[model samples]
Target chain A: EFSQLLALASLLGQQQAEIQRCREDLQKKESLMMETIAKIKALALEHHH
Target chain B: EFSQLLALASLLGQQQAEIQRCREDLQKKESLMMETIAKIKALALEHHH
Candidate 1:
């Protein structure tokens, strides 16, 4: 029973780590999206003028 | 011991579900990013002509 508990704990830790990584990746992608949109808007304005 | 095992297992299940959600969210963001880029490109082309 102890061994099984340890195994589950280990797996849980790994899952938590993966979740953190995913959060970080999502943040990075969001930042890139904002930057890209800003650049596109700037270009559109430039073309307008 | 058995109760602890059950608790850990439950938490593990929750973590797994969260990980799955993150993956789906990331995919959706990626799809949106691609679509946005495509539209920007199209607009740029139109302006070019």
Candidate 2:
């Protein structure tokens, strides 16, 4: 199967890797998005100050 | 109903190729992890420098 994957270059061996990559990508994006919301809240506070 | 000794199909819906793909995906990761551990034991000894 692995040989087939190598021959055909199937990504089956990297399915978990791709999933891990997806998870990390989403986590980073989500964290930055949360930070953006926090900054918005801070700006809102200053605008009302 | 699948143990190591009694390996049967595991699928919620009629056990198709996708399920086989899932199983293949899971097992491939496990095997790769084991291979990683084995290789690290050897290469890790070399990387201390």
Candidate 3:
């Protein structure tokens, strides 16, 4: 639902490279969040932290 | 429009559950927050000591 409308446009335009680029960027952000969460868990000794 | 009687019964039965769940969740979050703050206060006291 989030930005799906724009994603639909990109899909219709057949911009595979652009779509891949956006996905890569999103994955980077996701990995950063995961790394932060991992560090926090290591410090807090709990997943919630 | 869709199962009015059932909806009414469910609403009546679930209303208390909803309220209780909210209260429980709030209490849990508040307790966790208080513990975190208390730890901070304890650390500060240690520094002062």
Candidate 4:
């Protein structure tokens, strides 16, 4: 049972790494969304004149 | 068969954790997105005035 638990833990480590990668990918996307929103607002403000 | 069953169970647990983390990150981004949207709206209102 102990060895079985250890194998599960090892897999869990890899899963953590995979999840971290997902977080990074989503963070990049969120940044782009924010930047795009900012750009749209800037253009709107300029054109309002 | 026993080892394979263990591996499947381990993977399911990991995926659950990954999904939970992904949800948290997305929720944070959702909050940020709403905040940014509010800012854009406020700026537009101010400019219109």
**lDDT at residue B2 of model 2 (Cα atoms):** 16
Best by TM-score: 4
Q: What's the C-alpha lDDT at position B19 in model 2?
A: 54
Cα lDDT for residue B2, candidate 4: 43
Candidate 3 per-residue lDDT over residues A6-48, each given as its tens digit: 4454364465456547857975786576576556445444332
Poorly placed runs, candidate 1 (over 4 Å): A46-49, B1-49
Report, to 2 decimal places, the DockQ of model 1. 0.01
Residues B1-49, candidate 4: write the lDDT tens digits. Answer: 2454445545755776687698899768866765765565555555545
What is the C-alpha lDDT profile of model 4 across A2-36, one tens digit per residue?
45444554575577668768978987886676576
Alpha-carbon shift of residue A5 in model 2 (angstroms): 13
Candidate 2 local lDDT, A5-47, one digit each (tens) = 2422235446657876885787578667657655655555555
| lDDT by residue (tens digit), candidate 1, A1-49 | 2454445545755776687688789868866765765565555555545
> Interface RMSD, all models, one decimal each?
37.8, 25.3, 29.7, 36.9
Going through the candidates in the order shown, the clash numbers are: 0, 0, 0, 0
**DockQ for each numbered candidate:** 0.01, 0.02, 0.01, 0.01
Instruction: Write model 1 residue lDDT over B1-49, tens digit each, in one string.
Output: 2454445545755776687688789778866765765565555555545
